[PDB]
Write a protein that binds this ligand. Structure first.
Ligand code: SAH
Ligand code: SAH
Ligand code: HMK
Ligand code: HMK
Lengths: 357, 357
């Protein structure tokens, strides 16, 4: 027969069709403030208690229940049994948070809420209804532009989209501070360093975070003359204006945070070569630190690769941008003259790459 | 520390945030006719060949590539290496279909295309932007009605939505014929039967499919007097008008296809009790066959449960409908007086339940 494969095949097909539902359910849990509700309660919450805290109309309680059932199954909540109140009520299910949902508790350094809201915002999703036309047109543009008629950036700067613009900014600011946790969780990367040059460090926001964890590290914020201006620092902070394609101030290490993903291979190679020279004096002790995405298709964590590819598609459909695979990074690294490198997964699906001369 | 859980937590959180992308990518592959393109080719296709077959503008080729990479990773295509054409070209990747994507080949009894298109249509997705308001309002309605101002049914019958209405109808007709495969893949369920009563069989469409596989089975289409009318049959087909809550014509087996999911427990119990009586004369040899969804949270196939819950949420947000869990079915079955039952997974995530007196 071999056609009896139909079932095993349908299952796989349907699971991918209805996956979107799990995202919408996560979106709902964060917009309803369920995490904060449970967190503020202080202990497992029952349906009714949660419903009361959310101030739901009675008819919306069973809806809350349904979403909860799915979210619980997806690991965003844990079910517990708690006896009712005053004899009559028997036993009730109580919901507790899990590591994933704790990332939804507002007012905390770990809150990824703004990113969940932004990633699943209509401005992120609605454009897909234009996907077929987008594939079949002759104009080269983002899916967002194809569906909207304008670039995402322009759309955001509209006055009628001010709130959306804030939301997006909240997502970035959140993505930026998430880097502090990256430093805290990977001190080993910076421990033996006496100096570090932050390429494209702009006005020093990133270096400031670096100093919040490594205050003795001599950091140099390197960027264009016009961006760094006359900016001054202190004993362990200085600003240098130049062109990274010509040279990079020397230091024990070169940090390239979200810098190379905006450049093609040719331009990225130059930057990496100037980075190797920037650490040459330190010999084999120097290192270059790259912070960008790295997709490893051979990884055994298929789910992670899928997530990385998923994000890659978002970059594609919204900005026509791209993320590199582990292999593309390896080629740049070796073509640049480096000897070895080490990839450390950070922030759920991003990467921290240590490159050695 | 225990806070180092952040990464493991972020991964889980992000995967669920970006899951929707995998659905949109599947949607794109079906709207682009990639399956048919490869199928019609007859053998693994290269990027360019596929691009040529789809008649893509050169700028859209890398986009095709990206979607392909993600879809391949998700198991909808298999990568193969084929040498170029005429020396200069080296080796090129070639894409082959997989069981899942073969379900996308049009013009076949197994084509689930219409369902993919319908499930991921804007009319299915856009309403989610109204989810927060929906949870916080006092009006009891579907999410679709909350976002649109009208019921899905009314929306479909608009003249401006005629094509959408056709699409939806194509999805149902496709879901209906899929039942033929169900019969072919589960002949064992009907083999020892001499007679069968198709409750709510309407005008006999389902019975006709049943006769296409079991032509000697004496089938009785039972429905309301007004729906069955004076309709006549033949040796093995007859129509009987009545009220299933009062009684069901006797037969070796009672078929309840998509009948009980439209009734509450009270009403469903009556139907099941009348079904047990309809087969009483056949003694312990009789059986009742239920075709509806059954969600088993204790199942080891978490993915299947998630898909079932996902679908359940779709029913909820669009029709305010609901699907039963294995336990709810068990209670109805035993409350009805039956002794045992057996669940057989069908059509990716639906169920066929054999109930025994
Ligand atoms: N020739 C050049 N030399 C140095 N910096 C340059 C440059 N051309 C562009 N840039 C810088 O490229 C930077 C890209 S922003 C990269 C992200 C940043 N390191 C962060 O942590 O957020 C900008 O700050 C821009 O001023
Ligand atoms: N009292 C009653 N007795 C018998 N059928 C009834 C009924 N009230 C409603 N129905 C029938 O309920 C059916 C629900 S349709 C269920 C799906 C159908 N068996 C299929 O295979 O597609 C309708 O055909 C309707 O006429
Ligand atoms: O450096 C970053 C950090 C986070 C995000 C970025 C880029 O873009 C993709 C994204 O999916 C996204 C898309 C959005 C949005 C926020 C948002 O956050 C997510 O608001 C509207 O559209
Ligand atoms: O008995 C069935 C069979 C298939 C489907 C049903 C019910 O509803 C949910 C669905 O997700 C769906 C929703 C739709 C659609 C088609 C469609 O198909 C899917 O067209 C517009 O919205």
């Amino acid at each position: 027969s071999e056609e009896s494969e139909l079932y095993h095949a349908q299952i796989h097909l349907y699971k991918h069709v209805y996956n979107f539902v799990s995202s919408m359910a996560l979106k709902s849990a964060m917009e309803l403030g369920i995490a904060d509700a449970i967190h503020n309660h202080g202990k497992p919450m029952t349906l009714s208690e949660l419903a009361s805290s959310l101030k739901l109309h009675p008819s919306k309680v069973n809806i809350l229940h349904r979403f909860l059932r799915l979210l619980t199954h997806n690991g965003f909540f844990a079910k517990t049994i708690v006896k009712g109140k005053e004899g009559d009520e028997e036993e009730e299910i109580a919901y507790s948070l899990t590591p994933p949902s704790k990332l939804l508790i507002s007012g905390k350094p770990t809150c990824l809420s703004s990113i969940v809201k932004g990633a699943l915002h209509p401005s992120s999703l609605d454009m897909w209804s234009s996907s077929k036309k987008w594939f079949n047109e002759d104009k080269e543009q983002t899916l967002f532009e194809c569906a909207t008629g304008e670039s995402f950036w322009d759309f955001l700067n509209k006055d009628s989209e001010s709130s959306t613009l804030s939301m997006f900014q909240d997502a970035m600011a959140s993505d930026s501070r998430m880097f502090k946790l990256v430093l805290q969780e990977n001190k080993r990367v910076f421990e033996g360093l006496e100096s570090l040059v932050d390429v494209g460090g702009g006005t020093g926001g990133v270096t400031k975070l670096i100093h919040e964890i490594f205050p003795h590290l001599k950091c140099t914020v390197f960027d264009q003359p016009q961006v760094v201006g006359n900016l001054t620092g202190n004993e362990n902070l200085n600003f240098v204006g130049g062109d990274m394609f010509k040279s990079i101030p020397s230091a024990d290490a070169v940090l390239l945070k979200w810098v190379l993903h905006d450049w093609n291979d040719e331009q990225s190679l130059k930057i990496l070569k100037n980075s190797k020279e920037a650490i040459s004096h330190k010999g084999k002790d120097g290192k270059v630190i790259i912070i960008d995405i790295s997709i490893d298709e051979t990884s055994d964590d298929r789910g992670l690769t899928e997530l990385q590819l998923d994000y890659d598609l978002v970059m594609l459909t919204m900005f026509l941008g791209k993320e590199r695979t582990k292999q593309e990074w390896e080629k740049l690294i070796y073509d640049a003259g480096f000897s070895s490198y080490k990839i450390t997964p950070i922030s759920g699906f991003k990467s921290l790459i240590e490159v050695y001369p």
